[PDB]
Amino acid sequence: EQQLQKEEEARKVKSGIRQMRLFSQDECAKIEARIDEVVSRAEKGLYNEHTVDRAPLRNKYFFGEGYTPGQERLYPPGDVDEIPEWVHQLVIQKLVEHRVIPEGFVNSAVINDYQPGGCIVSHVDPIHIFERPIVSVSFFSDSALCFGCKFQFKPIRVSEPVLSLPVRRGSVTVLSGYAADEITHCIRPQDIKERRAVIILRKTRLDAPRL
Numbered sequence: 507e508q509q510l511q512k513e514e515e516a517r518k519v520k521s522g523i524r525q526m527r528l529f530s531q532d533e534c535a536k537i538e539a540r541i542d543e544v545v546s547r548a549e550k551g552l553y554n555e556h557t558v559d560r561a562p563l564r565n566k567y568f569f570g571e572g573y574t575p576g577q578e579r580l581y582p583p584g585d586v587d588e589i590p591e592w593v594h595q596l597v598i599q600k601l602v603e604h605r606v607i608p609e610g611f612v613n614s615a616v617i618n619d620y621q622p623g624g625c626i627v628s629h630v631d632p633i634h635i636f637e638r639p640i641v642s643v644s645f646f647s648d649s650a651l652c653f654g655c656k657f658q659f660k661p662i663r664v665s666e667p668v669l670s671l672p673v674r675r676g677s678v679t680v681l682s683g684y685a686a687d688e689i690t691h692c693i694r695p696q697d698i699k700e701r702r703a704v705i706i707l708r709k710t711r712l713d714a715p716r717l
Contacts (some may be wrong), residue, residue: 516669522685528653529676550706563624571614578632579717583590589615614697617707626693628655635714641707647700655692
């Protein structure tokens with residue numbers, strides 16, 4: 507049955523997801539103020555060209571490492587701005603202290619800032635660029651992350667994702683295995699009702715192809 511297939515898929519996705527409430531409301535407030543600083547600094551033209559990526563639904567800020575289909579390429583060393591001290595002190599440290607990731611692991615911090623009605627189209631985290639696990643921390647409001655995103659293209663055949671994962675403010679999502687390699691994920695516009703930001707902490711692969 508198609509029902510059994512969806513249930514085994516969702517179980518496999520679940521095995522690749524770990525999630526914990528790690529940041530208090532005050533800790534979130536401090537990080538959100540720092541996120542607002544990045545947005546302000548971008549608007550002041552203070553960042554490198556490749557640090558900032560502006561699109562209708564969302565702004566993307568690349569720190570430490572950055573990239574440009576499976577044809578993503580890492581920008582040459584020193585092309586994007588370095589990971590800001592507050593990311594180390596307020597975000598990465600908390601994660602290291604809670605043993606989510608080891609020290610020295612993260613060389614890439616991306617901030618995605620979403621407008622209401624913002625979305626991500628079905629995609630896989632590029633395996634040729636980034637090691638696993640992929641760590642993300644949500645900030646301004648609660649939302650959902652969907653896995654198995656055929657519905658975004660064939661809504662008559664399939665109306666729902668395989669799995670929808672609540673992503674609450676201050677929660678940490680860790681993706682590995684099946685959830686990171688074998689299935690697509692996306693965000694639905696109806697799931698972003700107000701401003702939402704997310705910090706994505708990753709390690710790039712040594713042989714990630716460069717420009």
